[PDB]
């Protein structure tokens, strides 16, 4: 398994996978992975040659800084679990790599029809960075899954959005 | 030169270009092309294997229906100029095709750091960038606020697209 923390190195591998003809699935996560997140990984492995999992606790989608600060961070353990599940690549960026000037002045994506603006923004950016053929999301957060399906339909992303029960 | 009017046929074209691994340049336009747009096309041709030009009068970036309705439409003459320049693809969608559920509740992109005009720009250019997935995209320097907007949008949103400003 490859663990990538920077944009240039991620871009290099995305390009390599593209030149190798790999079908790529992305599983976005905020880390603190449990057996339940493996449903996403297992669906992704069946549906692609290569599985990339992002781990990024996204400040733009937390209403309270207290909650962002207390969100569990267990990177070594997440990566252990992913490596055992045969994941190919983990993308684990820093906050500043994602939001160089902070979130308040960052370009955002809003899906009509703070929390959800944070979700469409980071998921669009992960789609632009990883350029996956397929991306897997839980059905449990049904508002989030609805928001991403609409975002994709509206914004022209060529990505199959897979809801996992 | 091929004229592509629908998303699924554009999808077909872009998927094919991707698996062929060609380097692709996109020139976004609203048609009514003249010398300045030809400079954009020339640059795109010099910088990529394949050049796509979009022609789409984007309602989201016009505040007044009167201004949208007055915008000149010269598709035949636009295609004549692009064909002469050996453009590979011209993407010329209808409004219903880009906005099948209307602009009002369409996803939008807004870049901080007429009310509505720039939001309409960032939104359509993001969508064009997702649809076409170009390696490079050319814009004029004269609309300097637009060029700055797109420059920031690309840097912020993580698009792997080289932005080229042309006089
Ligand atoms: C989709 C996601 C990883 C985006 O930050 C997050 O909202 C989540 O944990 O569902
Ligand atoms: C898979 C999951 C943990 C992702 O948030 C959630 O959808 C769930 O519990 O099914
Ligand atoms: C960039 C653009 C094609 C977006 O509709 C338009 O604003 C233009 O022609 O400058």
UniProtKB/Swiss-Prot annotation, chain A:
Binding site for ATP: 30-37, 138-141
GO cellular component term, pick one: cytosol
Regulation of this protein's activity per its record: Activation requires a combination of a divalent cation, magnesium or manganese, and a monovalent cation, potassium or ammonium. Above the optimum concentration for activation, magnesium and manganese are rather inhibitory. Also activated by 2-mercaptoethanol, dithiothreitol, cysteine and glutathione. Inhibited by divalent cations (mercury, cobalt, zinc, copper, silver), chelating agents (EDTA, EGTA and o-phenanthroline), and analogs of beta-alanine (taurine, gamma-aminobutyrate, gamma-amino-beta-hydroxybutyrate).
EC number(s) per entry: 6.3.2.1
GO biological process, one term: pantothenate biosynthetic process
Main location: cytoplasm
UniProt-annotated location(s): Cytoplasm
Positions that bind beta-alanine: 61
Annotated binding of (R)-pantoate, by residue: 61, 144
Active site: 37
Pathway in which the depicted protein is active: Cofactor biosynthesis; (R)-pantothenate biosynthesis; (R)-pantothenate from (R)-pantoate and beta-alanine: step 1/1
Residue ranges of the TM segments: none
Claim: Cytoplasm is one of the keywords in the record: yes
pH dependence: Optimum pH is 10. Stable from pH 5.0 to 11.0.
Catalytic reactions on record: (R)-pantoate + beta-alanine + ATP = (R)-pantothenate + AMP + diphosphate + H(+)
Temperature dependency: Optimum temperature is 30 degrees Celsius. Stable up to 37 degrees Celsius and loses activity almost completely when incubated at 60 degrees Celsius for 10 minutes.
The organism's place on the tree of life at top rank: Bacteria
Molecular function as annotated in GO: ATP binding; identical protein binding; pantoate-beta-alanine ligase activity; protein homodimerization activity
Record's keyword terms, sorted: ATP-binding, Cytoplasm, Ligase, Nucleotide-binding, Pantothenate biosynthesis
Keyword match Transcription: no
Functional note: Catalyzes the condensation of pantoate with beta-alanine in an ATP-dependent reaction via a pantoyl-adenylate intermediate.
Subunit annotation: Homodimer.
Recorded family membership: Belongs to the pantothenate synthetase family.
Extra facts: The reaction proceeds by a bi uni uni bi ping pong mechanism.
Protein name (Swiss-Prot/TrEMBL): Pantothenate synthetase
Organism (species): Escherichia coli (strain K12)
Gene: panC
Portion of the parent chain present: 1 to 176 of 283
From Swiss-Prot, chain B:
Active site (record annotation): 37 (proton donor)
Chief localisation class: cytoplasm
Disulfide links within the chain: none
Amino-acid positions noted as binding ATP in the UniProt annotation, renumbered to this chain: 30-37, 140-143
One GO biological process term: pantothenate biosynthetic process
One function term, GO molecular function aspect: pantoate-beta-alanine ligase activity
Residues annotated to bind (R)-pantoate: 61, 146
Catalysed reaction equations from the record: (R)-pantoate + beta-alanine + ATP = (R)-pantothenate + AMP + diphosphate + H(+)
Enzyme Commission number: 6.3.2.1
Field pH dependence: Optimum pH is 10. Stable from pH 5.0 to 11.0.
One annotated Gene Ontology cellular component of this protein: cytosol
Temperature remarks: Optimum temperature is 30 degrees Celsius. Stable up to 37 degrees Celsius and loses activity almost completely when incubated at 60 degrees Celsius for 10 minutes.
Residues noted as binding beta-alanine in the record, renumbered to the chain: 61
Keywords: ATP-binding, Cytoplasm, Ligase, Nucleotide-binding, Pantothenate biosynthesis
Pathway: Cofactor biosynthesis; (R)-pantothenate biosynthesis; (R)-pantothenate from (R)-pantoate and beta-alanine: step 1/1
Subcellular location: Cytoplasm
Description of how activity is regulated: Activation requires a combination of a divalent cation, magnesium or manganese, and a monovalent cation, potassium or ammonium. Above the optimum concentration for activation, magnesium and manganese are rather inhibitory. Also activated by 2-mercaptoethanol, dithiothreitol, cysteine and glutathione. Inhibited by divalent cations (mercury, cobalt, zinc, copper, silver), chelating agents (EDTA, EGTA and o-phenanthroline), and analogs of beta-alanine (taurine, gamma-aminobutyrate, gamma-amino-beta-hydroxybutyrate).
Function of the molecule: Catalyzes the condensation of pantoate with beta-alanine in an ATP-dependent reaction via a pantoyl-adenylate intermediate.
Miscellaneous field: The reaction proceeds by a bi uni uni bi ping pong mechanism.
Quaternary structure and interacting proteins, as annotated: Homodimer.
Family classification: Belongs to the pantothenate synthetase family.
Name by which UniProt lists this protein: Pantothenate synthetase
């Amino acid at each position: 398994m490859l663990i990538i923390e920077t944009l240039p190195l991620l871009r290099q591998q995305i390009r390599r996978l593209r030149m190798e003809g790999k079908r790529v699935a992305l599983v976005p996560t905020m880390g603190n992975l449990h057996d339940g997140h493996m449903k996403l990984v297992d669906e992704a492995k069946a549906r692609a040659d290569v599985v990339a999992v992002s781990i990024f606790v996204n400040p733009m989608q937390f209403d309270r800084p207290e909650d962002l600060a207390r969100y569990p961070r267990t990177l070594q353990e997440d990566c252990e679990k992913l490596n055992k599940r045969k994941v190919d690549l983990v993308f684990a960026p820093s906050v500043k790599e994602i939001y160089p000037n902070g979130t308040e002045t960052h370009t955002y994506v809003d899906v009509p029809g703070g929390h959800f603006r944070g979700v469409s923004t980071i998921v669009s950016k992960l789609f632009n960075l990883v350029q996956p053929d397929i991306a897997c999301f839980g059905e449990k957060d049904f508002q989030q899954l609805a928001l991403i399906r609409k975002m994709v339909a509206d914004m022209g992303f060529d990505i199959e959005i897979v809801g996992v029960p």
